[PDB]
Symmetry: C2
């Protein structure tokens, strides 16, 4: 068998928020007791860098060590499609293993962001479903959040990004509210943030203010 490697993207939000700290995480699992010593080499765009903070060789419950490496990463670099390569070496593995990871290749595409009121059929229930459609973004990396009057709303769910037919991605996120809350016309709002949005953030609202 032998040691194997995994390369982990930064979180989209890290990637797009003005002070957050984007990281790439290269992990080795199955690192033997007999040959426990592991070498990390990091490359940015084929060229070696040296700023990754390696972490205390943690031992596991099945006779195995796992060591993690965390290169800190400049938002511009990521959004610019640098490639990040993890090179792991073990005394007990013929050649060393390589993982490379980057943002997805292609022209970014701007999300359209439409909020949707719940069915006319659905009013009778005592909970309601507030719908946020996001379509035509590229790449699939995004973050969606709901709120009302400058406060988070934590009863929502978003599907994963779905590969549309014109090559782009759409996705829905559903926030569920006690129906009263929608009787009283509390404005609710869908705050999406993506790389190809201007200011990488837009947000849309909804209440039902009908008749006059």
């Amino acid at each position: 068998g032998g040691p194997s490697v995994f390369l982990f993207p930064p979180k989209p939000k890290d990637t797009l928020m003005i002070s957050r700290t984007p990281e790439v995480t290269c992990v080795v699992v199955d690192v033997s007791h007999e040959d426990p010593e592991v070498k990390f080499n990091w490359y940015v765009d084929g060229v070696e860098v040296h700023n990754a903070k390696t972490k205390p060789r943690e031992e596991q419950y099945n006779s195995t060590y796992r060591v993690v490496s965390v290169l800190t990463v400049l938002k511009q670099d990521w959004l610019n499609g640098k490639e990040y390569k993890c090179k792991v070496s073990n005394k007990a593995l013929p050649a060393p293993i390589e993982k490379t990871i980057s943002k997805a290749k292609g022209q970014p595409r701007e999300p359209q962001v439409y909020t949707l009121p719940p069915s006319r059929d659905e009013l009778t229930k005592n909970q309601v479903s507030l719908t946020c459609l996001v379509k035509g973004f590229y790449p699939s990396d995004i973050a969606v959040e709901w709120e009302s009057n400058g406060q988070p709303e934590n009863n929502y769910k978003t599907t994963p990004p779905v590969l549309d037919s014109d090559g782009s991605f759409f996705l829905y996120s559903k926030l569920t509210v006690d129906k009263s809350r929608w009787q009283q016309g509390n404005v609710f709002s869908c705050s999406v943030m993506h790389e190809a949005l201007h200011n990488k953030y837009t947000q849309k609202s909804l209440s039902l203010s009908p008749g006059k």
Copy 2:
């Protein structure tokens, strides 16, 4: 051994009156040098064998792959029976194992609402009709759109998401020319699921005053 992979039947195949629900056991990483794979299937640990093994297939990097298929009664799956594929090959260590069956627990019936394009999305030359299916369990479901009882082709359905009450939801997006929205054509989200009365419901959607 190497790898082995059990695979459920498609929702649709199990909810529709005369489909053939089958289960699939792909073996991947079989070596040219010794292949000749065996297969022993069991429903609830018993023994029948209405199963016919695909003759061995092909490669891409000098590596084989085998498959087999067992036709299955649409009630046995729905009632819960467990299904095992004992791929019975020497190669490396010993006989491999995989199990599969339906999600256990009480079928809950799909809420189904059609949502109409937003005021805004109307400044485009294609529009999107939404179909929300929520509150169902288990996740095996199937969704289609239609007009004049002829199927709509340009749509995409999200996979099922675990909601906060242990149920699923998914949305389905049908995408039409803004023009067809105008005329007043009716479009049908057509959902199939075991907890549905008749394993089928459908909602109409139109431009209403």
